[PDB]
Amino acid sequence: SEYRVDLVVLSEQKQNCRFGLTFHNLSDQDLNSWGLTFAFDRYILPDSVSNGQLTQIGSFCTLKPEGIVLAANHHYYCEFSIGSNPFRYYSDGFNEAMIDFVVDGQPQRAQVDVTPIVLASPYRERSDIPASLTHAQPLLPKPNHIEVSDHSFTFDEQAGVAIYTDLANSAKAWLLEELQRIHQFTLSSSNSGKIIFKSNPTLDEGAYKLKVSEESIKIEAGSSSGFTHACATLLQLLKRDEATKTMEAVCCSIIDSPRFRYRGMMLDCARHFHSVEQVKRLINLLAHYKLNTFHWHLTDDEGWRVEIKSLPQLTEIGAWRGIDETIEPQYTHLSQRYGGFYTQEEIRDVIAFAEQRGITIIPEIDVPGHCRAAIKSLPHLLIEAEDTTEYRSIQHYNDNVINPALPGSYEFIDKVLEEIAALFPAPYVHIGADEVPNGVWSKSPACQALMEQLGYTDYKELQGHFLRHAEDKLRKLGKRMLGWEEAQHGNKVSKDTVIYSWLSEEAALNCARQGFDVVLQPAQTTYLDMTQDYAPEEPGVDWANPLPLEKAYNYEPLAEVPADDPIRKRIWGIQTALWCEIINNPSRMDYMIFPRLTAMAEACWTEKQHRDWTDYLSRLKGHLPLLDLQGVNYRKPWK
């Protein structure tokens, strides 16, 4: 390109970084009435900008220069600062840049080459995974009881699969589907088959037995999920022999059951849209590691991804962003129209696909904050034009909070929650309920009136009025409300609202003892957007620290909470999350999720006493070839 932008660290002190920004006109003609636009995921301090006017809306930054012309071969220099500690990674720099300009009274655009940032203080350390042997049974998660014998069962495509209970129907169909998809091994269902599915009603939900004899395999379970898990194990246990068209399983006795009931994964689809094809692909992979819940985060400030038939603007407007759209670009795709949404038909198809693998889908509708896409889609319904309140969200927005005095806000939430409740069969809806920015609604006339009506003195308490409505609406719709961390404080919600705790384990147990059911999703150990290593080339974010494989594996949930403790009745289980601020490609998503998803899965399933880092590594090492057969772009632990 003819245009280039170089960003450099000029100074690093306690909670302050200063940068030099040089823009280079390397074209042969002058730039007239020009402006620099770029994406940057840190809040630039407004007082800091030394030579031009900066506006910032989220990641979308625009720098208007003082001078009206930048001559050919000339340079424009600007300094700015951020409130942060040193950058350790190249992704902390500008993701993208472009210029707007005028040649002969006509508006023009051009992409700018962004030079990688010159870091001052990259990490010197590196996470090193020791050399590992290859475990003969590469099982992830580790079964709680496995006893291996000296012989093996070798079978061809006519071995046959027998089924003596309808509870095993979906598991059986999934096993055959996967053996076809992965290995091209076609097993047929036979009444006299060598692979047997048998009912055993003494076994608990999710539990199974799996015994490989010399000339047969017997799977026992008392639940549909039981049979599904046995089939996930069996997929990992089988070794295909390419010389023949045969499969081999080691003779062994497996008795297994889940440590936790809720074993989930959250995917952020609002930040970047991931196709139906990638969601299905990911959902199937979750079932390989015995997870049972897909938490679909479908809305946020940067996008609305779920078709609401009664409010079609939420997708027609809210699902798209860019320069020529209502919603400004964010993170990536600075110059393109970026977006997409899931149709209700697509969502039904994903739901049906997920239940074939024992996966429940929990939809999330973020309110009253994290609501910019909604608000920008429905301004006549959601904007109070007379509201002058100056506030700032954590993602540095001043216009992203639903107004709880406007009747349109209740028309919005009711219509959305009605269609979500009918579409999603799971008896749970996640409502977001992040704490709103401080002093929000304080200079809203409509809210002043509602405060007087309800007799509240503090404006914070209106979010509890809004959330109580959402909760009661969902109750009438046969749904139980779910919320994030901060929903527990104040009287915001009832004790039937399930809390997804990300602060700490100590805090989650605090929340549990107040009466709430809780899901553990601690940001320090389960956020797969975090970098996997200290090298500055590594993709990801680091705000909650880098999350190397070993750190991920050392997450031992409820380690000091005794086996028979009454508080464990309130722990639903564990969740791991993928936030997608900087994840827009399937390739990059595979990279962040794998191999750490397997460590998370093992924390969810395997009892603490059967967990071991060395043993895990050997099982992961033997599992890597199976991920290659499926073309999963995992991060190689040994490179």
Side-chain angles (χ1 to χ4, degrees), residues 106-144:
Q106 284 284 301
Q108 302 291 334
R109 294 185 188 159
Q111 283 184 349
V112 180
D113 291 332
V114 183
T115 306
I117 193 165
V118 177
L119 293 172
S121 295
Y123 284 111
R124 228 60 61 178
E125 42 270 17
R126 294 289 181 281
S127 90
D128 289 307
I129 292 173
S132 179
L133 302 184
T134 305
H135 204 288
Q137 297 77 61
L139 299 171
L140 295 166
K142 180 80 186 187
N144 288 316

Side-chain angles (χ1 to χ4, degrees), residues 140 289 549 593-603 616 620 623:
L140 295 166
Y289 308 111
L549 185 59
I593 298 171
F594 299 92
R596 285 173 306 175
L597 188 77
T598 59
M600 300 292 95
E602 195 151 297
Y616 165 79
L620 181 58
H623 181 66

Side-chain angles (χ1 to χ4, degrees), residues 265 267 269 272-286 294 296 342 350 353 578 583-591 593-594 630-633:
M265 190 269 161
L267 186 67
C269 290
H272 287 93
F273 177 72
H274 316 295
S275 55
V276 168
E277 296 98 300
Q278 289 305 309
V279 173
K280 289 181 170 202
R281 188 171 162 277
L282 179 56
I283 286 164
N284 183 58
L285 284 164
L286 299 182
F294 183 65
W296 213 349
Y342 311 112
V350 172
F353 175 95
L578 192 69
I583 301 172
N584 64 9
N585 325 278
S587 195
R588 175 56 48 75
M589 177 178 300
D590 282 3
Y591 192 83
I593 298 171
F594 299 92
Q630 307 170 85
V632 180
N633 188 40

